[PDB]
Curated annotation (Swiss-Prot):
Heme-based protein that delivers nitric oxide gas (NO) to the victim while feeding, resulting in vasodilation and inhibition of platelet aggregation. Reversibly binds nitric oxide (NO). Also binds tightly to histamine, which is released by the host to induce wound healing. NO release is pH dependent and linked to loop dynamics. Pfam families: Nitrophorin. Heme binds at residue 59. Disulfide bonds join 2-122, 41-171. This is Nitrophorin-4. It is found in: Secreted. GO terms for molecular function: histamine binding; metal ion binding; nitric oxide binding; oxidoreductase activity. The keyword GTP-binding does not apply. One of its GO terms (biological process) is vasodilation.
Length: 184
C-alpha cells in the first residue's frame, strides 16, 4: 500500500518535461519491503501526442529477461500530478492488455530540470499495489546523480544513500520504440 502524498515541484515546467524525449531511471527507492527486484531497469518517454498527454514505459528485469512496454494517457490532478490508466503493448504499440478500471498509476514530478528529475509513483494493478516508488531520472542513461536532484531527494526527507542504482545491470534501451509509443 502507498502512503505518501508526494508534492509536485513548485513552478514545474510541463512542456519541458513532456517534450517527447526519453528519461532513464538511474536510481530507485521502494518504501515497501521487497516490492520490486533489487536489479532492474526502466525508462519512459513523456510528451503530448495530438493534443493528448502521454507516457510510454519500458521495464526490463536484467536477470529474468522479463520485458514489457506500456502506453498511457495522463489525466491532470494538479500541476505535476497525474493519474495514468495504462495499456500493456508490444514495442510497436499493439495492445496486449487493454486499459481497464483498476489498472492505473499516479505520477508526481517532485523535481525536474532539463537533464534530471525526481518522481513518485503509486501503481495500482487489480489486486496489487506496488507501494510508494521514487525514481531519479536522467536524460543520459549513465549519469551519476548531480547536486540538484540529490538535494531534491534530501528536501523530500529521503536519503539518497538508500536508493538502488540501475547502472550496473548492462541494460540497453530501445529509445526509438519509446518515442514512437507516445503516439499509440
Ligand atoms: C519510472 C517510473 C515507473 C512507472 C511509472 C512504473 C509503472 C508501472 C506500471 C504501469 C506497471 C504495470 C504494467 C502492466 O502490467 O502493464 C509496472 C509494473 C512493474 N514495475 Fe514499474 N514503473 C516505474 C518504474 C519501476 C522501477 C524503477 C521498478 C523497479 C524495480 C519497477 C518495477 C515494476 C515491477 C516489478 C512491475 C511488475 C508488477 C507486477 O505485475 O506484479 N517499476 N510499473
Amino acid at each position: 500500500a502507498c502512503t505518501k502524498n508526494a508534492i509536485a515541484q513548485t513552478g514545474f515546467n510541463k512542456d519541458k518535461y513532456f517534450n517527447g524525449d526519453v528519461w532513464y531511471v538511474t536510481d530507485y527507492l521502494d518504501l515497501e519491503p521487497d516490492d520490486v527486484p533489487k536489479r532492474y531497469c526502466a525508462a519512459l518517454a513523456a510528451g503530448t501526442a495530438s493534443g493528448k498527454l502521454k507516457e510510454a514505459l519500458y521495464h526490463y528485469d536484467p536477470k529474468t529477461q522479463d520485458t514489457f512496454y506500456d502506453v498511457s494517457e495522463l489525466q491532470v490532478e494538479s500541476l505535476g500530478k497525474y493519474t495514468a490508466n495504462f495499456k500493456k503493448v508490444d514495442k510497436n504499440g499493439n495492445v496486449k492488455v487493454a486499459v481497464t478500471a483498476g489498472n492505473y498509476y499516479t505520477f508526481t514530478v517532485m523535481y525536474a530540470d532539463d537533464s534530471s528529475a525526481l518522481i513518485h509513483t503509486c501503481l495500482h494493478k487489480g489486486n496489487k499495489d506496488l507501494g510508494d516508488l521514487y525514481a531519479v531520472l536522467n536524460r543520459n542513461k549513465d549519469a551519476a546523480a548531480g547536486d540538484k536532484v540529490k538535494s531534491a531527494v534530501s528536501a523530500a526527507t529521503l536519503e539518497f544513500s538508500k536508493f538502488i542504482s540501475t547502472k550496473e545491470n548492462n541494460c540497453a534501451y530501445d529509445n526509438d520504440s519509446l518515442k514512437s509509443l507516445l503516439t499509440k
